[model samples]
Target: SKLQDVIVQEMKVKKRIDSAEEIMELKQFIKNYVQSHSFIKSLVLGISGGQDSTLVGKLVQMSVNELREEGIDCTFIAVKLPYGVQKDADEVEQALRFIEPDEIVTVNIKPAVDQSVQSLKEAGIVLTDFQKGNEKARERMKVQFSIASNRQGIVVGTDHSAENITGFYTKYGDGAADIAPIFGLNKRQGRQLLAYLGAPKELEDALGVTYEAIDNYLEGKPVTPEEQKVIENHYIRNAHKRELAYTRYTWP
Candidate 1:
């Protein structure tokens, strides 16, 4: 009962239907924040051509455009960091077609990943696909931060509660963002928001499993532990990613 209430609240906050006006409100929230920060007039983020990034890209664009209308001179920079050749290059092009960000950047992170692998090898640590993938994730963060730092802006992240539940992100990599606009939202809510914003159908379709299944497992509609065993295992494997460094220091 408690879990269902939170799920409903999440859906309500995002608005499951007829949410056009809420999109504008979200944009206004972005503007309000940037105006208050004063020191930051730009937004930077890495777009993986996924639903999460697509939704955020459009929202950021709308907010910056609103700021521009008020003569505030704000900017939104969207980046694409692919690993080497990028298996789904077409999907990225398809995403950019709709995101229509104010400014765009493309940075290939293969070289950085390779260098990190070599460094790890020198330290007597052999790297595998999983390790290399995390390295790529960190390299992408490095790129995003480089752009944000160079332009005196904040790094926008696409992390949401669904991914958080599974710990499905790299530590100090995709997990290291300056700010997260969709942090508390679940994966299903994210897709709903994207759909409400008129996001490309392809993006939503690519998510594979139905949101109903996710919602059932998350809210424990039937309360089946086996349904969530996969997610729980992933969460356990990556729990360390969410933990901060601990120092045994009591003396001042």
Candidate 2:
């Protein structure tokens, strides 16, 4: 019920953001909200280094810089969660290396994740590994919220449109947040936002890889990453559509 309300409100917000003019209005609202919400102190982002996070992170930077230039006392905290994910960590590191926020923290969670997955396997479901990917995300947010509490602040999230609309996000994983700028946008829109920020070539290349891979996975087509997998037995593509029998499509 809680999440449903947010989804409804999100739809309303997206409709208002159908143009560049509206995008700035929404973006400006977020900037002001974060700063004022500090009575609420700081904004903490769990940057996963993927294109979505990268694009959102840039806005975070822009927002904070604007506030600072205008003499606001708000701070942006960029934290990384390695959690036994070296590859993903490297992606987050790439962004952290570039943005270099006010205060940053890192935490690892391999052992905890391994134990949890093993427990799920013993239950006979044998399907938590994929879910485990999300557990890492949730645990990291838990940590961010815990730390941010001491700072009199709230945690921000970096998920975008396509994931939210397609139900690709973990409920409490990347989806849990006090504030989310990208939830209204999609992968393509995110790319546009990053381009507007003058993001580097390397980031652009990395994002291209992610979108293509996601498309291939969703459409049952041949994606480079899917082909490079040595253990996967097959790639099954599925039909793509925004509205199906059990789903509804309406935007803000």
Candidate 3:
């Protein structure tokens, strides 16, 4: 029970608020953090046409726009890291239209992922479908980080409370980022924020549990026994991702 409470607190989820207020708070959080980092000039994020990415892209764009108005040299670069041709091209287009990022760059990751898989195969290490999927995710992140490093930008992650609670992201892949603007919001709340921003509403449970149950659990509400057990199992199992790198304790 304490773990549950701690998770909620760590996520920064609080009593629900109007979407307008949430948007202001999230935008201000991003702007303030970026301002604090004087050397940062760009915000980079990989866009996948998903709800989370769309929402984050919009927020990043808004933050950078406000920063520019304040005489800060900042821009939002939305990256399209398609393995090849994205199946949801229309959705990606729609999201881009809504986000209106300062710069849009497309990188085809198929070659990189394929080369990595082929190299692994040549090394006599066969990868399964799941492993390959993670390779793609990591490749996308690698590209984002590369861009960020080159442009003096920080990579923005789309991770939120729901994904964090279940550890649904690939380690060092979508999970790695310089900053997470939506880390404190759950899936539903994320949708609400998007709707408030006037973005098209489009709405994942990998743990055989619905987001409603997960959000309820995160909000200190009730969930079924089975749901609670599944949620907790994931929380405990993914603790590594949520913590600093482990090292044997040593006195200075």
Candidate 4:
């Protein structure tokens, strides 16, 4: 119970927020952070048409627009990293329309991911489908970072508290970013922000829990034994994902 309380505090999960207030705060946060860094002139993120990225895309674009209004040289670059052909291409189009990003780019990850997998196979290391899936994510991040590098921008991540609590993102993949604007919001809270922004609307089981349960728990509400067990297990197992790399030293 104490550890749960600590985690709730650490993640900064609020009991609730007025959607309008949350949006303003998040947009200002992004704007101020970028403005403080003179060299970073843009924000870049990969949009998969998922709710998280859609929400993040809109916020980033809004922030960049605000910065430009103030005469700050800033832009938002929305990237599409498809493994081969995205099955739900229409949803991505819808998201881009909603975001109205300053620039759009697409990088097919199929060749890079496949080439890595092929090289691994040549090395006598056969990766399973699940492992290959992680490679796809990392490859997407690689492309995003490459664009950010050449454009003097920083990679923006879509990680929010719900996914962070369960460690659902790939380490150094979607999890790696120069900044995270929505890390404090849970899944439902994210949706609330999106609804307030008038964006299009749109996980469980492996941890033996639902997002509602996790959200409630994070909000300092009571949860059943099974839900608590699953949540705590995942939280502990994935703690490394949320921390800096490990190092050991002894000094006298």
Candidate achieving the largest TM-score:
4
Error of 4 at 58 (Å): 0.4
- Best-first order by lDDT: 4, 3, 1, 2
Regions more than 4 Å wrong, model 2: 1-23, 38-40, 118-127, 201-252
Instruction: Judge candidate 3 against the unseen true structure and give its global Cα lDDT, from 0 to 1.
Output: 0.87
Of the two candidates 1 and 2, the one with more favorable TM-score, higher being better, is 1
TM-score of each: 0.81, 0.66, 0.95, 0.96
Model 1 residue runs over 4 Å out of place are: 1-18, 202-211, 217-222, 228-243, 246-252
User: Across residues 1-252, which tens digit of lDDT does each residue of candidate 1 receive?
Assistant: 354454444433332334575566667777888888888867998878777778777788888888888878778898889888865777677777787888889899988889989998999999999888889888988999999988889888877656644555888986588777766566776676787767766353433344555554454455345445544554445555545764566222
Assess each prediction's global lDDT (C-alpha) against the native.
0.72, 0.60, 0.87, 0.87
Across 1-252, the per-residue lDDT of candidate 2 in tens digits comes to 243343334433232234456447646866779656548457787777777667666667667778777777777778776776556666677777666687887766677766777887888857556777777766776778886797777777765544633445555665567877665554555565566556664243322235444433333334454332410221111112222333355421
Give candidate 4's whole-model lDDT: 0.87
Which structure among the candidates has the greatest lDDT? Answer: 4
Model 1, position 174: C-alpha lDDT score: 69
State which candidate, 1 or 4, has the greater lDDT: 4
**Residue-pair clashes per candidate, as listed?**
0, 8, 0, 0
Q: What is the lDDT of residue 12 in candidate 3?
A: 78
Which whole-number lDDT from 0 to 100 does residue 122 have in model 3? 100
Model 3, 1-252: lDDT tens digits are 676787778877765868888889889999999999999989999888999999999998998999999999998999998888986888888998999999999999999999999999999999999999999999999999999999999999988888876676998887589988888788889888888888874445368788788898888887888888888888878877866777785312
- Pairs that collide in candidate 1 are none
RMSD to the hidden true structure, all candidates: 4.5, 9.2, 2.1, 2.1
Could you give candidate 4's per-residue lDDT for residues 1-252 as a string of tens digits?
787897788778899999889999999999989889999988999989898899999999989888989989998999988888985788888998999999999999999999999999999999999899999989988998999999999999988888866776998886689888999899889888888888765402676888899999889898998898888888877777887776674211
